[PDB]
């Protein structure tokens with residue numbers, strides 16, 4: 001079987017992408033943030049503290065004839081940005097773009113951090129990292145992808161994120177009309193539970209490509225591109241007036257500047273991020289200082305190929321017994 005669903009940016013900056021997901025019987029449709037950096041499927045629900053819900057669509061397990069409470073199971077997650085949520089666990093039927101999994105663990109939020117409450121357009125997250133990171137206790141639960149794997153035509157999913165435009169998540173098949181040229185595959189390490197791989201280097205604008213190994217994770221759930229301080233300094237040095245701002249929390253640049261492109265290596269292939277993808281607009285309404293889309297990973301501890309990088313490519317998440325990542329231009 002296969003599944004295919006359109007994913008849509010939540011705002012004019014592509015801060016995140018939401019994809020409709022059908023949960024329960026009859027279907028309750030929620031718009032979830034597909035996150036290859038985490039492994040919990042959790043949703044705003046009728047159990048969420050009422051003051052912490054502000055416009056989100058909620059899952060109501062009592063209205064689903066297929067929902068079953070998972071006795072004694074709880075979950076609690078903390079994301080790298082400081083966000084968190086926690087609650088209890090149901091199993092229910094979950095469908096993505098025609099692809100149905102029965103008995104999927106659906107984690108019902110009882111408490112969420114302020115960043116989720118203020119994001120009225122995100123009804124929850126759908127984790128797509130490896131199931132070793134799932135936070136359900138005492139019995140760890142499997143991801144939607146892991147549950148669907150056996151029935152998929154091919155054990156893969158692909159991310160085709162749009163720049164200021166809709167895109168597509170496909171499960172079980174590779175759309176050969178969605179990319180140009182060839183797909184270049186690269187080795188994945190699962191030892192930390194992430195889609196972790198090694199980029200072969202980088203270039204800034206039309207500059208010389210620097211061959212250097214950059215270990216990082218492919219994370220649809222993170223907005224920006226987080227790279228080592230040396231790389232990020234070399235990029236912003238080509239932008240007149242750009243500087244690192246402690247008060248703002250990263251590199252900013254005069255909004256009137258034109259940004260250079262950024263190239264990253266995938267084996268012998270090259271993915272080019274257009275400079276416009278790196279502009280994240282004024283730091284505050286009316287400001288002439290703009291926030292950069294490439295930032296240092298030094299405080300994070302791991303490099304993150306987030307949406308800024310992934311939306312420049314067609315990305316194959318190959319969940320074969322030896323998993324690999326594929327990148328193609330588009």
Ligand SMILES: NCc1ccc(C(F)(F)F)cc1
Nearest residue numbers: 037038079080219221222302
């Ligand atoms: N998108 C989920 C996520 C959040 C944080 C991290 C970090 F920062 F710990 F690497 C990775 C993945």
Ligand SMILES: NCc1ccc(C(F)(F)F)cc1
Nearest residue numbers: 035079083115116119221222
């Ligand atoms: N990386 C996972 C993640 C995704 C979205 C959010 C936000 F923006 F909704 F708070 C936080 C963390």
